[PDB]
Amino acid sequence: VSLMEKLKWKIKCIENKFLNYRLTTNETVVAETEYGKVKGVKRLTVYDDSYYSFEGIPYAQPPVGELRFKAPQRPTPWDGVRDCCNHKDKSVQVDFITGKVCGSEDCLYLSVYTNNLNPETKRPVLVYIHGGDFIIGENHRDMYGPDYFIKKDVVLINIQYRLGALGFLSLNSEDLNVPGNAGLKDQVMALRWIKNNCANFGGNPDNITVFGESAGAASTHYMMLTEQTRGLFHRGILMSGNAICPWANTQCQHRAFTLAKLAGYKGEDNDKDVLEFLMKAKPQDLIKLEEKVLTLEERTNKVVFPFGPTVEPYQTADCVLPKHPREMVKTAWGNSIPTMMGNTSYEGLFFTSILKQMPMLVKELETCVNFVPSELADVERTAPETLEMGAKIKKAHVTGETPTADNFMDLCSHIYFWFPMHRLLQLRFNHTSGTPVYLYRFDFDSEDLINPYRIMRSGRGVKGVSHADELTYFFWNQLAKRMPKESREYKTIERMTGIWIQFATTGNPYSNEIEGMENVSWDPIKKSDEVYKCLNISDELKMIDVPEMDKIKQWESMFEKHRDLF
């Protein structure tokens, strides 16, 4: 991120602070929770809608001291009224713009928003789990403002969960009670809080929808797979990701020692001594060093992040992932709830600035062997069969004589998003009883309204609908502005929030009340479908054959002689 962009961001931060003051009213309100009373405040939006805001509701004990690296524990109840009129800190992380460590270990909070605390009818509850690769993100309204959803009669809840090594350390030794996935266990505890408390805010505990984007989509999927959450919610929406994406989990049990060593540990590699050192470390030090943890071998093998969701090495009471997610799909309770899945029309445009920093990456398209699924490839990636599989990937994405950066980004859309979605759909049809799954494709391009992710990819002036570009149409953020009612952007806000709310309400995303949806016949995907249909969201709403299907089929063809692994 350039120094000019950093200055513009700082300016936006300050301006956003004073806008948020002007949007605060003097009306506060008290609501009940199982742990004690909370005070919220009525806020305005720039469109002059209003909503009651409760931020900083604890769903777990602060995971500090001996609770670091442990599963979340239930919070301590209080007498009196807890002030929830301001946000709490985010989980310790490297700030995506400034490059500096920020946040706090005291981060296990959720925020609840509704336009009416005493409505005449119990309301759909929508629960957003943010993305950020399990290493960044927050529920702060400078990125996740509820301003668009609260136009309608729903309850919206935005959770936090532990990130990085603090959320995802895993150790093999059963005696230490650090099996992994603390951050997913935070999500479980938040979902339990929501089921038990949403009625106090006007919500319907029999009608909860969980949704998330990127790592938040993998998280939502993990919440639909684990027995820990069986029956806690009733619809799921996976936006640009799922739990069988290659980036969504890793076996990180040996990496705690490496982190400890980077942080000054002088002892031997045994879990007990490694843990005692890590329990004494400053959390900023651990998070700052995480970028150095992956070894030369792991980088060679394209491991993306050192710490993340993992298959837990032994069983505990709070265990979230007892087997690989592909195996968990086969018995998952969430296969039996209405599900919606989708991606943007140019996911891989996310990698724009990486390709600018490392132009030589395009040389990987010469043979494409490094993109062959690891379960199909020989270790050296020199076997004739592996070369043949790489050639099939190359045919799918290299459209001209010389591979280009755009070819690379198109490949990225498939390896990270479309192909795992296809593999999940096909796996799941073998373990569900007709519960519907609906596909969307977000294909609306604008630079008149943006979100901070565009700054990350150095995406100013870049055309195309990148990963995370849809979040602009769901959440207010500090870069947003009021848009005219007749503008294409305003209409897209209404359509996206409208479709999500309609799906959350009924489990069917179609409604004749959404502008431009009147002539839409949106069927879910059937086991017998050879070509997926999706609702393509552009300036118009249209059912189409998924344009990516041909390339999806070319990826699938690598498994023709290895169908047991598909």
TrEMBL record:
<dbReference type="Pfam" id="PF00135">
    <property type="entry name" value="COesterase"/>
</dbReference>
<feature type="modified residue" description="N6-methyllysine">
    <location>
        <position position="88"/>
    </location>
</feature>
<feature type="modified residue" description="N6,N6-dimethyllysine">
    <location>
        <position position="394"/>
    </location>
</feature>
<feature type="modified residue" description="N6,N6-dimethyllysine">
    <location>
        <position position="42"/>
    </location>
</feature>
<keyword id="KW-0325">Glycoprotein</keyword>
<keyword id="KW-0719">Serine esterase</keyword>
<feature type="modified residue" description="N6,N6-dimethyllysine">
    <location>
        <position position="330"/>
    </location>
</feature>
<feature type="modified residue" description="N6-methyllysine">
    <location>
        <position position="330"/>
    </location>
</feature>
<feature type="modified residue" description="N6-methyllysine">
    <location>
        <position position="553"/>
    </location>
</feature>
<feature type="modified residue" description="N6,N6-dimethyllysine">
    <location>
        <position position="302"/>
    </location>
</feature>
<feature type="modified residue" description="N6,N6-dimethyllysine">
    <location>
        <position position="561"/>
    </location>
</feature>
<feature type="modified residue" description="N6,N6-dimethyllysine">
    <location>
        <position position="491"/>
    </location>
</feature>
<feature type="modified residue" description="N6,N6-dimethyllysine">
    <location>
        <position position="481"/>
    </location>
</feature>
<dbReference type="InterPro" id="IPR019826">
    <property type="entry name" value="Carboxylesterase_B_AS"/>
</dbReference>
<feature type="modified residue" description="N6-methyllysine">
    <location>
        <position position="70"/>
    </location>
</feature>
<feature type="modified residue" description="N6-methyllysine">
    <location>
        <position position="302"/>
    </location>
</feature>
<keyword id="KW-1015">Disulfide bond</keyword>
<feature type="modified residue" description="N6-methyllysine">
    <location>
        <position position="527"/>
    </location>
</feature>
<feature type="modified residue" description="N6-methyllysine">
    <location>
        <position position="356"/>
    </location>
</feature>
<feature type="modified residue" description="N6,N6-dimethyllysine">
    <location>
        <position position="195"/>
    </location>
</feature>
<feature type="modified residue" description="N6,N6-dimethyllysine">
    <location>
        <position position="6"/>
    </location>
</feature>
<feature type="modified residue" description="N6-methyllysine">
    <location>
        <position position="195"/>
    </location>
</feature>
<feature type="modified residue" description="N6-methyllysine">
    <location>
        <position position="282"/>
    </location>
</feature>
<feature type="modified residue" description="N6-methyllysine">
    <location>
        <position position="395"/>
    </location>
</feature>
<feature type="modified residue" description="N6,N6-dimethyllysine">
    <location>
        <position position="551"/>
    </location>
</feature>
<comment type="similarity">
    <text>Belongs to the type-B carboxylesterase/lipase family.</text>
</comment>
<dbReference type="InterPro" id="IPR029058">
    <property type="entry name" value="AB_hydrolase_fold"/>
</dbReference>
<feature type="modified residue" description="N6,N6-dimethyllysine">
    <location>
        <position position="151"/>
    </location>
</feature>
<feature type="modified residue" description="N6,N6-dimethyllysine">
    <location>
        <position position="122"/>
    </location>
</feature>
<keyword id="KW-0378">Hydrolase</keyword>
<feature type="modified residue" description="N6,N6-dimethyllysine">
    <location>
        <position position="392"/>
    </location>
</feature>
<feature type="modified residue" description="N6,N6-dimethyllysine">
    <location>
        <position position="553"/>
    </location>
</feature>
<feature type="modified residue" description="N6,N6-dimethyllysine">
    <location>
        <position position="261"/>
    </location>
</feature>
<feature type="modified residue" description="N6,N6,N6-trimethyllysine">
    <location>
        <position position="533"/>
    </location>
</feature>
<feature type="modified residue" description="N6-methyllysine">
    <location>
        <position position="6"/>
    </location>
</feature>
<dbReference type="InterPro" id="IPR002018">
    <property type="entry name" value="CarbesteraseB"/>
</dbReference>
<feature type="domain" description="Carboxylesterase type B">
    <location>
        <begin position="30"/>
        <end position="543"/>
    </location>
</feature>
<feature type="modified residue" description="N6,N6-dimethyllysine">
    <location>
        <position position="463"/>
    </location>
</feature>
<feature type="modified residue" description="N6,N6,N6-trimethyllysine">
    <location>
        <position position="151"/>
    </location>
</feature>
<feature type="modified residue" description="N6,N6-dimethyllysine">
    <location>
        <position position="323"/>
    </location>
</feature>
<feature type="modified residue" description="N6,N6-dimethyllysine">
    <location>
        <position position="70"/>
    </location>
</feature>
<feature type="modified residue" description="N6,N6-dimethyllysine">
    <location>
        <position position="37"/>
    </location>
</feature>
